[PDB]
Each structure stands twice: as C-alpha cells, then as structure tokens.
Tab-separated table of C-alpha atoms and ligand atoms in Angstrom:
chain	number	residue	atom	x	y	z
A	8	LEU	CA	172.786	46.676	30.357
A	9	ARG	CA	171.947	48.867	27.354
A	10	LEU	CA	172.953	46.928	24.236
A	11	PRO	CA	172.518	47.744	20.526
A	12	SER	CA	169.922	46.017	18.395
A	13	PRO	CA	170.832	42.764	16.589
A	14	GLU	CA	169.950	44.426	13.267
A	15	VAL	CA	173.248	46.360	13.376
A	16	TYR	CA	175.364	44.149	15.694
A	17	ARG	CA	174.959	40.407	15.149
A	18	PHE	CA	176.929	39.444	18.285
A	19	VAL	CA	174.066	40.559	20.573
A	20	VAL	CA	171.319	38.124	19.512
A	21	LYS	CA	169.693	36.337	22.440
A	22	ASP	CA	171.120	32.908	23.221
A	23	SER	CA	169.018	29.895	22.252
A	24	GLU	CA	169.341	26.395	20.834
A	25	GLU	CA	169.036	27.957	17.358
A	26	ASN	CA	172.530	29.482	17.572
A	27	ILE	CA	174.420	28.067	20.571
A	28	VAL	CA	174.485	24.772	22.481
A	29	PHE	CA	176.359	24.091	25.724
A	39	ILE	CA	182.894	28.445	33.074
A	40	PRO	CA	180.348	26.809	30.758
A	41	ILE	CA	182.032	24.493	28.261
A	42	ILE	CA	180.836	25.467	24.782
A	43	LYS	CA	179.596	22.441	22.834
A	44	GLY	CA	178.766	24.213	19.579
A	45	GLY	CA	176.778	26.897	17.827
A	46	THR	CA	176.847	29.428	15.003
A	47	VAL	CA	180.137	31.078	14.079
A	48	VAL	CA	178.690	34.385	15.295
A	49	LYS	CA	178.016	32.883	18.726
A	50	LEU	CA	181.468	31.276	18.802
A	51	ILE	CA	183.139	34.661	18.285
A	52	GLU	CA	181.015	36.140	21.086
A	53	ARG	CA	182.066	33.432	23.551
A	54	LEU	CA	185.655	33.799	22.314
A	55	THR	CA	185.661	37.511	23.239
A	56	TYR	CA	183.083	37.595	26.035
A	57	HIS	CA	182.674	40.641	28.270
A	58	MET	CA	181.539	38.764	31.391
A	59	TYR	CA	184.726	36.712	31.784
A	60	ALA	CA	187.860	35.468	30.042
A	61	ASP	CA	188.092	31.876	28.774
A	62	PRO	CA	191.778	31.056	28.186
A	63	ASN	CA	191.085	27.378	27.470
A	64	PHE	CA	188.446	28.246	24.865
A	65	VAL	CA	190.884	30.621	23.149
A	66	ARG	CA	193.589	27.957	22.825
A	67	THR	CA	191.178	25.336	21.468
A	68	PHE	CA	189.469	27.751	19.062
A	69	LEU	CA	192.640	29.123	17.458
A	70	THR	CA	193.897	25.537	17.107
A	71	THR	CA	190.813	24.113	15.361
A	72	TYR	CA	189.057	27.100	13.755
A	73	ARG	CA	190.491	26.359	10.294
A	74	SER	CA	188.197	23.328	9.955
A	75	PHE	CA	185.099	25.558	10.063
A	76	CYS	CA	186.345	29.135	9.507
A	77	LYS	CA	188.859	30.532	7.042
A	78	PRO	CA	191.629	32.746	8.484
A	79	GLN	CA	190.420	35.730	6.457
A	80	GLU	CA	186.923	35.128	7.850
A	81	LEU	CA	188.213	35.059	11.437
A	82	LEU	CA	189.914	38.452	11.128
A	83	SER	CA	186.797	39.943	9.525
A	84	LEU	CA	184.639	38.688	12.401
A	85	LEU	CA	187.057	40.077	14.995
A	86	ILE	CA	187.019	43.446	13.228
A	87	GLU	CA	183.221	43.194	13.154
A	88	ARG	CA	183.247	42.322	16.861
A	89	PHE	CA	185.501	45.319	17.554
A	90	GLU	CA	183.320	47.910	15.803
A	91	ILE	CA	180.525	48.062	18.396
A	92	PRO	CA	177.722	50.614	17.848
A	93	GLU	CA	176.226	52.640	20.661
A	94	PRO	CA	172.575	51.876	21.507
A	95	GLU	CA	169.714	54.294	20.951
A	115	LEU	CA	176.163	55.084	28.094
A	116	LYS	CA	179.485	55.606	29.916
A	117	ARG	CA	179.078	52.274	31.711
A	118	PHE	CA	178.361	50.688	28.322
A	119	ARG	CA	181.731	51.971	27.087
A	120	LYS	CA	183.276	50.593	30.306
A	121	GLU	CA	181.378	47.346	31.000
A	122	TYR	CA	180.891	46.161	27.402
A	123	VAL	CA	182.904	48.114	24.823
A	124	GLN	CA	185.979	48.276	27.063
A	125	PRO	CA	186.108	44.566	28.070
A	126	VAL	CA	185.166	43.155	24.648
A	127	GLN	CA	187.804	45.167	22.784
A	128	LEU	CA	190.355	43.999	25.361
A	129	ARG	CA	189.308	40.384	24.766
A	130	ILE	CA	189.789	40.775	21.004
A	131	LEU	CA	193.299	42.184	21.421
A	132	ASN	CA	194.151	39.259	23.704
A	133	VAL	CA	192.944	36.910	20.960
A	134	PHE	CA	195.188	38.833	18.558
A	135	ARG	CA	198.077	38.135	20.948
A	136	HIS	CA	197.613	34.356	21.117
A	137	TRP	CA	197.032	34.268	17.348
A	138	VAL	CA	200.298	35.950	16.340
A	139	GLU	CA	202.220	34.168	19.124
A	140	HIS	CA	201.157	30.514	18.869
A	141	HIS	CA	199.745	30.349	15.315
A	142	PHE	CA	201.823	32.841	13.335
A	143	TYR	CA	201.931	30.443	10.362
A	144	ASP	CA	198.539	31.807	9.266
A	145	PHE	CA	200.295	35.081	8.412
A	146	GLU	CA	203.285	33.370	6.775
A	147	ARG	CA	201.091	31.291	4.453
A	148	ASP	CA	198.967	34.406	3.763
A	149	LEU	CA	200.846	37.712	3.688
A	150	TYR	CA	197.602	39.598	3.020
A	151	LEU	CA	196.158	38.351	6.320
A	152	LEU	CA	199.060	40.048	8.121
A	153	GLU	CA	198.728	43.249	6.083
A	154	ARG	CA	195.098	43.605	7.177
A	155	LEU	CA	195.985	43.064	10.839
A	156	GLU	CA	198.934	45.476	10.766
A	157	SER	CA	196.695	48.238	9.394
A	158	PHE	CA	193.793	47.589	11.772
A	159	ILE	CA	196.147	47.427	14.762
A	160	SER	CA	197.782	50.724	13.778
A	161	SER	CA	194.370	52.353	13.263
A	162	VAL	CA	193.357	51.711	16.893
A	163	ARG	CA	194.381	54.882	18.755
A	164	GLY	CA	192.489	54.244	21.988
A	165	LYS	CA	193.798	55.046	25.446
A	166	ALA	CA	193.852	51.677	27.223
A	167	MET	CA	194.269	49.757	23.949
A	168	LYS	CA	197.685	51.366	23.369
A	169	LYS	CA	199.508	48.882	25.610
A	170	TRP	CA	197.966	45.836	23.918
A	171	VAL	CA	198.570	47.264	20.432
A	172	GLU	CA	202.272	47.744	21.178
A	173	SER	CA	202.388	44.218	22.618
A	174	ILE	CA	200.999	42.698	19.411
A	175	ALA	CA	203.432	44.751	17.318
A	176	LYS	CA	206.354	43.467	19.396
A	177	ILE	CA	205.307	39.859	18.766
A	178	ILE	CA	204.976	40.488	15.025
A	179	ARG	CA	208.460	42.029	15.003
A	180	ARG	CA	209.903	38.967	16.756
A	181	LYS	CA	208.368	36.530	14.263
A	182	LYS	CA	209.667	38.586	11.325
A	183	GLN	CA	213.285	38.503	12.543
A	184	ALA	CA	213.420	34.689	12.639
A	185	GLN	CA	213.697	34.510	8.837
A	193	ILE	CA	224.991	23.243	16.719
A	194	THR	CA	225.124	23.321	20.516
A	195	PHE	CA	225.509	20.088	22.492
A	196	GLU	CA	225.109	19.850	26.260
A	197	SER	CA	226.292	16.243	26.635
A	198	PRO	CA	229.050	14.709	24.477
A	199	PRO	CA	227.533	13.219	21.325
A	200	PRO	CA	228.542	9.677	20.343
A	201	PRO	CA	230.972	9.162	17.455
A	202	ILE	CA	229.579	8.541	13.983
A	203	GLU	CA	229.928	4.861	13.091
A	204	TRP	CA	230.962	3.935	9.546
A	205	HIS	CA	231.012	0.592	7.743
A	206	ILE	CA	231.938	0.124	4.060
A	207	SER	CA	230.921	3.522	2.676
A	208	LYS	CA	233.559	6.089	3.594
A	209	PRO	CA	232.451	9.679	4.299
A	210	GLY	CA	232.316	12.210	1.488
A	211	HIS	CA	231.157	9.656	-1.118
A	212	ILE	CA	227.355	9.715	-1.328
A	213	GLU	CA	227.425	7.511	-4.439
A	214	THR	CA	228.227	4.262	-2.589
A	215	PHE	CA	225.545	4.816	0.081
A	216	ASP	CA	223.240	1.812	0.459
A	217	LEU	CA	221.398	-0.087	3.179
A	218	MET	CA	224.203	-2.650	3.517
A	219	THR	CA	227.157	-0.333	2.828
A	220	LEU	CA	226.304	2.195	5.543
A	221	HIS	CA	226.643	1.362	9.225
A	222	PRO	CA	223.378	0.109	10.790
A	223	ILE	CA	224.085	2.092	13.968
A	224	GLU	CA	224.334	5.394	12.089
A	225	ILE	CA	221.424	4.491	9.788
A	226	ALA	CA	219.106	4.295	12.791
A	227	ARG	CA	220.705	7.416	14.291
A	228	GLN	CA	220.281	9.622	11.215
A	229	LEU	CA	216.789	8.260	10.556
A	230	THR	CA	215.869	9.089	14.156
A	231	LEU	CA	217.263	12.620	13.813
A	232	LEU	CA	215.309	13.097	10.580
A	233	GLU	CA	212.072	11.631	11.955
A	234	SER	CA	212.483	13.707	15.124
A	235	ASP	CA	212.846	16.979	13.208
A	236	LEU	CA	209.877	16.046	11.016
A	237	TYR	CA	207.891	15.156	14.146
A	238	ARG	CA	208.607	18.469	15.890
A	239	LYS	CA	207.630	20.667	12.925
A	240	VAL	CA	204.103	19.200	12.733
A	241	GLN	CA	201.590	21.772	14.022
A	242	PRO	CA	198.251	20.720	15.557
A	243	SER	CA	196.379	22.795	12.955
A	244	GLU	CA	197.680	20.442	10.240
A	245	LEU	CA	195.744	17.540	11.819
A	246	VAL	CA	192.282	19.141	12.164
A	247	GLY	CA	189.564	18.635	9.567
A	248	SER	CA	191.590	16.138	7.494
A	249	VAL	CA	193.162	19.151	5.795
A	250	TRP	CA	195.823	16.962	4.167
A	251	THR	CA	193.007	15.324	2.162
A	252	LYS	CA	191.579	18.638	0.905
A	253	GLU	CA	192.679	20.769	-2.054
A	254	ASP	CA	195.059	23.216	-0.328
A	255	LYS	CA	197.035	20.480	1.404
A	256	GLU	CA	200.436	21.836	0.325
A	257	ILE	CA	199.694	25.088	2.202
A	258	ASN	CA	197.639	24.099	5.251
A	259	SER	CA	199.637	20.957	6.162
A	260	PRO	CA	203.167	21.214	4.732
A	261	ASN	CA	204.954	19.455	7.591
A	262	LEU	CA	202.304	16.759	8.067
A	263	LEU	CA	202.710	15.742	4.421
A	264	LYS	CA	206.500	15.537	4.742
A	265	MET	CA	206.104	13.288	7.791
A	266	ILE	CA	203.740	10.992	5.882
A	267	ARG	CA	205.737	11.037	2.637
A	268	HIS	CA	208.846	10.081	4.618
A	269	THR	CA	207.029	7.231	6.375
A	270	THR	CA	205.645	6.048	3.029
A	271	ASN	CA	208.986	6.197	1.204
A	272	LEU	CA	211.041	4.614	3.993
A	273	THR	CA	208.548	1.758	4.363
A	274	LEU	CA	208.607	1.058	0.619
A	275	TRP	CA	212.396	1.473	0.503
A	276	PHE	CA	212.797	-1.233	3.149
A	277	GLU	CA	210.486	-3.461	1.102
A	278	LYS	CA	212.444	-2.574	-2.044
A	279	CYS	CA	215.734	-3.626	-0.440
A	280	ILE	CA	214.148	-6.940	0.593
A	281	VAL	CA	212.320	-7.972	-2.572
A	282	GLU	CA	215.059	-6.871	-4.997
A	283	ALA	CA	217.653	-9.062	-3.231
A	284	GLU	CA	217.246	-11.952	-5.659
A	285	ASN	CA	220.080	-13.920	-4.043
A	286	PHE	CA	218.698	-15.921	-1.120
A	287	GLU	CA	221.850	-15.543	0.983
A	288	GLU	CA	221.847	-11.794	0.305
A	289	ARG	CA	218.139	-11.420	1.097
A	290	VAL	CA	218.580	-12.974	4.550
A	291	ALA	CA	221.469	-10.635	5.386
A	292	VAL	CA	219.488	-7.599	4.211
A	293	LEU	CA	216.479	-8.567	6.334
A	294	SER	CA	218.821	-9.230	9.260
A	295	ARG	CA	220.467	-5.837	8.732
A	296	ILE	CA	217.017	-4.230	8.930
A	297	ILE	CA	216.318	-6.022	12.219
A	298	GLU	CA	219.582	-4.600	13.562
A	299	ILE	CA	218.241	-1.165	12.612
A	300	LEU	CA	215.020	-2.092	14.418
A	301	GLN	CA	217.041	-2.941	17.535
A	302	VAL	CA	218.844	0.412	17.510
A	303	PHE	CA	215.482	2.104	16.921
A	304	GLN	CA	214.222	0.408	20.094
A	305	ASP	CA	217.270	1.594	22.045
A	306	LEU	CA	216.694	5.161	20.810
A	307	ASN	CA	212.939	4.993	21.598
A	308	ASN	CA	212.124	5.727	17.948
A	309	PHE	CA	208.856	3.811	17.866
A	310	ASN	CA	208.021	5.578	14.603
A	311	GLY	CA	211.053	3.950	13.002
A	312	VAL	CA	210.267	0.758	14.916
A	313	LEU	CA	206.735	0.403	13.543
A	314	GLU	CA	207.819	1.575	10.082
A	315	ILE	CA	209.974	-1.553	9.816
A	316	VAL	CA	207.034	-3.581	11.148
A	317	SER	CA	204.883	-2.057	8.401
A	318	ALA	CA	207.426	-3.314	5.853
A	319	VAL	CA	207.679	-6.897	7.123
A	320	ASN	CA	203.865	-7.083	7.312
A	321	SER	CA	203.334	-5.827	3.757
A	322	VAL	CA	201.732	-8.065	1.143
A	323	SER	CA	205.030	-8.576	-0.706
A	324	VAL	CA	207.325	-9.192	2.284
A	325	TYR	CA	205.077	-11.097	4.694
A	326	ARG	CA	204.784	-13.967	2.189
A	327	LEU	CA	208.573	-14.556	2.203
A	328	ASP	CA	208.336	-17.417	4.678
A	329	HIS	CA	211.648	-18.931	3.557
A	330	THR	CA	213.518	-15.653	4.088
A	331	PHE	CA	212.151	-15.133	7.607
A	332	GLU	CA	212.836	-18.805	8.396
A	333	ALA	CA	216.582	-18.553	7.682
A	334	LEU	CA	216.957	-15.914	10.413
A	335	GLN	CA	218.768	-16.379	13.703
A	336	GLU	CA	216.720	-17.407	16.726
A	337	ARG	CA	217.443	-14.055	18.392
A	338	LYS	CA	216.717	-11.936	15.306
A	339	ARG	CA	213.263	-13.457	14.804
A	340	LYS	CA	212.392	-12.989	18.486
A	341	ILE	CA	213.276	-9.287	18.292
A	342	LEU	CA	210.986	-8.913	15.274
A	343	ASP	CA	208.182	-10.880	16.946
A	344	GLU	CA	208.288	-8.516	19.932
A	345	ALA	CA	208.142	-5.461	17.663
A	346	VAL	CA	205.155	-6.826	15.724
A	347	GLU	CA	203.257	-7.512	18.958
A	348	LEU	CA	203.587	-3.802	19.781
A	349	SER	CA	201.143	-3.015	16.957
A	350	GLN	CA	198.852	-5.976	17.673
A	351	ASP	CA	195.538	-5.502	19.499
A	352	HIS	CA	195.235	-1.841	18.453
A	353	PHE	CA	198.784	-1.005	19.590
A	354	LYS	CA	198.058	-2.174	23.138
A	355	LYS	CA	201.664	-3.122	23.909
A	356	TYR	CA	202.889	0.026	22.141
A	357	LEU	CA	200.790	2.433	24.219
A	358	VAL	CA	202.161	0.816	27.381
A	359	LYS	CA	205.719	1.057	26.028
A	360	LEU	CA	205.414	4.718	25.004
A	361	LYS	CA	204.462	5.722	28.561
A	362	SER	CA	207.060	3.704	30.499
A	363	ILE	CA	210.069	5.363	28.806
A	364	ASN	CA	211.829	8.731	29.012
A	365	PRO	CA	212.679	11.243	26.268
A	366	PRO	CA	214.285	11.748	23.815
A	367	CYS	CA	211.820	9.643	21.821
A	368	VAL	CA	209.977	9.681	18.505
A	369	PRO	CA	206.526	8.131	19.003
A	370	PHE	CA	204.705	6.311	16.227
A	371	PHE	CA	202.911	9.021	14.255
A	372	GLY	CA	200.495	6.603	12.568
A	373	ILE	CA	198.489	5.872	15.713
A	374	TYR	CA	197.693	9.591	15.961
A	375	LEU	CA	196.316	9.753	12.409
A	376	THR	CA	194.083	6.723	13.000
A	377	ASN	CA	192.367	8.164	16.082
A	378	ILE	CA	191.847	11.479	14.272
A	379	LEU	CA	190.142	9.864	11.273
A	380	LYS	CA	187.897	7.794	13.549
A	381	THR	CA	186.813	11.075	15.167
A	382	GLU	CA	186.469	13.108	11.963
A	383	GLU	CA	184.101	10.439	10.600
A	384	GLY	CA	182.369	9.326	13.810
A	385	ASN	CA	181.325	12.925	14.539
A	386	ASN	CA	179.507	15.264	12.170
A	387	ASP	CA	180.929	18.701	11.380
A	388	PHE	CA	177.589	20.337	12.263
A	389	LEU	CA	174.950	20.161	14.990
A	390	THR	CA	171.190	20.384	14.532
A	393	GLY	CA	166.438	23.390	14.372
A	394	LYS	CA	169.266	24.915	12.340
A	395	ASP	CA	172.794	23.955	11.295
A	396	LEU	CA	175.291	24.884	14.019
A	397	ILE	CA	179.068	24.494	13.982
A	398	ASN	CA	179.838	21.308	15.923
A	399	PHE	CA	182.676	22.584	18.108
A	400	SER	CA	182.879	19.498	20.342
A	401	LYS	CA	184.110	17.491	17.347
A	402	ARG	CA	186.934	20.006	16.911
A	403	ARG	CA	187.779	19.683	20.610
A	404	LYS	CA	188.085	15.894	20.326
A	405	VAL	CA	190.543	16.271	17.444
A	406	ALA	CA	192.361	18.860	19.569
A	407	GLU	CA	192.753	16.392	22.448
A	408	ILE	CA	194.511	13.942	20.118
A	409	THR	CA	196.912	16.671	18.983
A	410	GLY	CA	197.490	17.620	22.625
A	411	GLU	CA	199.160	14.253	23.203
A	412	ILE	CA	201.581	15.139	20.386
A	413	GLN	CA	202.687	18.325	22.179
A	414	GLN	CA	204.511	16.494	24.985
A	415	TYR	CA	206.971	14.548	22.782
A	416	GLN	CA	208.358	17.418	20.670
A	417	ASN	CA	210.614	19.603	22.853
A	418	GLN	CA	213.342	17.088	23.692
A	419	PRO	CA	216.212	16.894	21.181
A	420	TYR	CA	218.420	13.854	20.782
A	421	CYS	CA	222.076	13.968	21.813
A	422	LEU	CA	223.148	12.619	18.407
A	423	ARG	CA	225.384	14.429	15.933
A	424	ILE	CA	223.984	15.047	12.455
A	425	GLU	CA	225.655	13.689	9.314
A	426	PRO	CA	225.059	15.949	6.279
A	427	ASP	CA	225.859	13.396	3.561
A	428	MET	CA	223.695	10.744	5.231
A	429	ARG	CA	220.995	13.339	5.961
A	430	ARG	CA	220.295	14.134	2.302
A	431	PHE	CA	220.475	10.416	1.476
A	432	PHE	CA	217.314	9.679	3.473
A	433	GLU	CA	215.760	13.047	2.582
A	434	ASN	CA	215.967	12.108	-1.122
A	435	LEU	CA	214.776	8.492	-0.877
A	436	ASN	CA	212.428	7.851	-3.816
A	437	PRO	CA	212.003	4.103	-4.394
A	438	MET	CA	208.905	4.532	-6.582
A	439	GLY	CA	210.865	6.476	-9.208
A	440	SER	CA	208.210	7.759	-11.600
A	441	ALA	CA	205.518	5.113	-11.032
A	442	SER	CA	202.649	5.501	-8.591
A	443	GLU	CA	202.362	3.657	-5.288
A	444	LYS	CA	199.831	1.221	-6.760
A	445	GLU	CA	202.156	0.496	-9.688
A	446	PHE	CA	205.159	0.068	-7.383
A	447	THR	CA	203.372	-2.188	-4.882
A	448	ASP	CA	202.253	-4.377	-7.789
A	449	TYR	CA	205.912	-4.500	-8.833
A	450	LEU	CA	206.861	-5.538	-5.292
A	451	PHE	CA	204.221	-8.281	-5.275
A	452	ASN	CA	205.131	-9.600	-8.730
A	453	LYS	CA	208.825	-9.520	-7.801
A	454	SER	CA	207.995	-11.377	-4.577
A	455	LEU	CA	206.375	-14.160	-6.617
A	456	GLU	CA	209.703	-14.488	-8.474
A	457	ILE	CA	212.112	-14.800	-5.535
A	458	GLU	CA	209.820	-17.136	-3.545
A	459	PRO	CA	207.087	-18.506	-5.823
A	460	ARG	CA	203.783	-19.811	-4.474
A	461	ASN	CA	204.553	-23.530	-4.556
A	462	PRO	CA	205.879	-26.224	-2.190
A	463	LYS	CA	209.136	-26.250	-4.183
A	464	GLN	CA	212.382	-24.648	-3.070
A	465	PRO	CA	213.144	-21.073	-4.177
A	466	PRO	CA	215.551	-20.894	-7.124
A	467	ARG	CA	219.040	-19.462	-6.744
A	468	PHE	CA	219.885	-16.220	-8.558
A	469	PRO	CA	223.331	-14.624	-8.988
A	470	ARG	CA	224.104	-11.803	-6.574
A	471	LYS	CA	224.279	-8.354	-8.178
A	472	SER	CA	226.217	-6.775	-5.286
A	473	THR	CA	229.967	-6.755	-4.684
A	474	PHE	CA	230.358	-5.656	-1.045
A	475	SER	CA	230.547	-7.950	1.984
A	476	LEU	CA	227.355	-9.234	3.606
A	477	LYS	CA	229.015	-9.229	7.045
A	478	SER	CA	227.366	-6.892	9.541
A	479	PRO	CA	229.560	-4.755	11.829
A	480	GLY	CA	227.093	-5.225	14.697
A	481	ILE	CA	225.129	-3.050	17.081
A	482	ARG	CA	227.728	-2.513	19.825
A	483	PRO	CA	229.361	0.906	19.233
A	484	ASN	CA	232.892	0.191	18.047
B	501	LIG	N1	207.495	-18.069	7.992
B	501	LIG	C1	207.355	-16.967	8.216
B	501	LIG	C2	207.167	-15.483	8.520
B	501	LIG	C3	206.703	-14.626	7.518
B	501	LIG	C4	206.527	-13.270	7.782
B	501	LIG	C5	206.840	-12.815	9.097
B	501	LIG	C6	206.683	-11.438	9.437
B	501	LIG	C7	206.989	-10.999	10.723
B	501	LIG	C8	207.449	-11.907	11.681
B	501	LIG	C9	207.602	-13.248	11.350
B	501	LIG	O1	208.063	-14.159	12.309
B	501	LIG	C10	207.288	-13.700	10.030
B	501	LIG	N2	207.446	-15.022	9.731
C-alpha cells in the first residue's frame, strides 16, 4: 504494498521511459527517479551512492539535494504497520546512510556553504525516531570530527642541495642560482600537494569553466594555474636569455631538472617542461637546441616521445613504476572534456538527466584516486616553497599578451633568416656552471 498517491509523494510514480532509463545499473532519468533509486527500499546500492554523491553537482545543486532527501524522508501514509516497516522504515534508513557518506566523503559541500550544514543539523536533530537514533548520533559524530580539523618522516630524507643561492636569502633565487636537484624536489613536493588536494567533484561538469569556479573547484584551479605559470616561467627563462652561451646553459639546466623529475616519477613536471620546449616561442630556437650535448638532447627526445601518439609511451610508463609519483594531470583533463562534449547532459519522450555521462567522468576521476595517498620522502624547504608558489611571469599582462611577448622576443634572439643569431651582452653575473645531478 500500500503506497501513497503520486499527487502527494512524487517518489512513487510508476517507472517508465518517461522518467527513468536503465542490481540494475541506472543509466539515467528524472532527478525524482534518481533520488528514489539512491534511497531504494528493496535493496541498498553502495556503488550508486558513491557515484551519485561524486557527480550530482553537475545536475543538482547541493541545496536541492538536501531538499529532495527531506522530501523523500517525509512519507505520507496511504488512504499499515507493514508499510511503516517495509517502506517507511527502510527508506528513512537509506536516507540516513546517504547522509553518512555525504558528510564523510564530501564534507566540502558544507564548508563552502555553511547554510547547507545548518539545515542538516536542524533536520537531523528533529528526527526523534526509535531506530533512527543510532544513525542520527553517527552522523553527528562525523560532523563533530570534521569541525575539529580546523613533520613526521619514516625513512631518512635526503639532504637539501644548494648551489649559488645560500639559504635565508629569497632575493637571489633564480633558475640558475638554485640547485637543480632541489628545484625538482621542491617542485615535486608542491605539485604532489596540489595533486592530492584535487577532489573528484572539481572535475565533473567542467565546473572550472562555469561562473562559481572559485568555490566549486578551488584546488583544481590552483593545479592548473601552477602548471600554466611554471610552463611560461620556463619559457620566460629561455627566451629572455639574450646571450647565446647563457641560453644554452639555461636550457641545459632545465633538462637536468627534467632528468631529476624522471627519477622522482614526477611526470607532471616532466611533461610541463615538454610543454615549454614545444611552445611556439621555444620550439623555433633551432640554434639553441643544436648547441646541446648529445646526451642532453637524447634525454629531451625521450621525454617528448612520452606525449607523442596521444601519450602512448606515457601511459605505459605511468603503470610500470611505483609510488611516490605525480602523474601528468593534463591527460586527465583532456579525457574529461572529450566526454563532457561527446555525451549530452540529458537523455530523451521527455528530458531526463543523463547519468551515464556523469559515470564516465567519474571513471576518469577514479584513476586519480590511486596516485594521491603516497607522500614523498623529501624534506620541504620553506624559502624555496614560497618561491614557486609566488611565480608570476606574466606580471600584469594577460596570457595572450605574454605569449605574444615570448614570440616577438624569440624573433629577436634567433631571427627567421639563414643568418647567424647576433650576440648580445649577458645581463647575469653568476656562473653558468651546473653543479650536476649526482647528490653531492
Ligand atoms: N633544431 C632543433 C630543435 C628545436 C626544438 C626542439 C624541441 C624539442 C626537442 C628537440 O630535439 C628540438 N630540436
């Protein structure tokens, strides 16, 4: 069975292709049918709960989800006993279990929106049922743990290598003054921490391209803005080296950073350097790449081939290693955009929420889960940490204005002619000698 009429309880409408399309794997359907399958009385679907709470923000606002769960909780009696035990009792237990996984795995919804938590804390306290008391106290315990959150080394860390810049003096920090070993170490520690803070909800629905990008995807933007700045900073250090002898040493020093990146399995930092040497302003410096050592150019050629053929050699290299590693985060964004555009957000006699598209984007984020919980055994350097955290090569100009500056500056150092590149006086004063890659 005896169920209420759909005129007062929308979660009881008969199933059809007008509201739901297919433990049966749910392909899609109306948001009312998705909440019913999320908190179904016949059985429990733990896999559907994890995928829904991970991708629901692309088709349902967090305030809307809590309102639907409250609507699903308030069940009216038909025009019983078994109904209050075979329908009301199981459904309300399913909703509380959804409240558990929500506040446990995706508590950031309540941090970004304090009003969303205030509504839940009042609705949870208002439930004074008998069997629901244990689940209510369980949710309250999880909320208390998340509210209280606001340098141990197992193995001996390696010593911090220094070159020309002595510690405590952030002013003289540059690409050539710092030690290339520690540059790749601190960049790996920074890229690792930025990689671990990225939540799968920040990569669903292209939310970093929407309006509220600074709220929905705060960590994803910092990972992209670091990749963008570090790639342009490498290009800036190459194209601004007007002296030919200095420009070869700078490019060689970057390859030495690429080699340490390879040894640390920081493919993100590996392919960021590859993105710099393949840029429009750096790739045309044929005379600079020609003056390299025979071993330096071979190391770069191997790193470029990792990205060739849709990262075929890279995907084989990422599997055959062991953590700690920082995988290339750009290959994940590319497969997500190809799915967000190749699949429509809705299914169609009526418009239904295309849930299978959200699942595909969830499978891409699932591959990111396995490379996060494995810290590096490298000691952090505070002065060098803020140096790469505050890298801003564009200054006040946009990326289009800065890339045009890099291309016009590239035409100055190595002009487009068969003639030799002119010699410019070196503006630096330090030594162009590299300390090497072997830890000294
Ligand atoms: N001449 C030359 C030249 C120019 C750009 C390059 C970029 C990556 C690898 C290379 O070998 C390159 N060689």
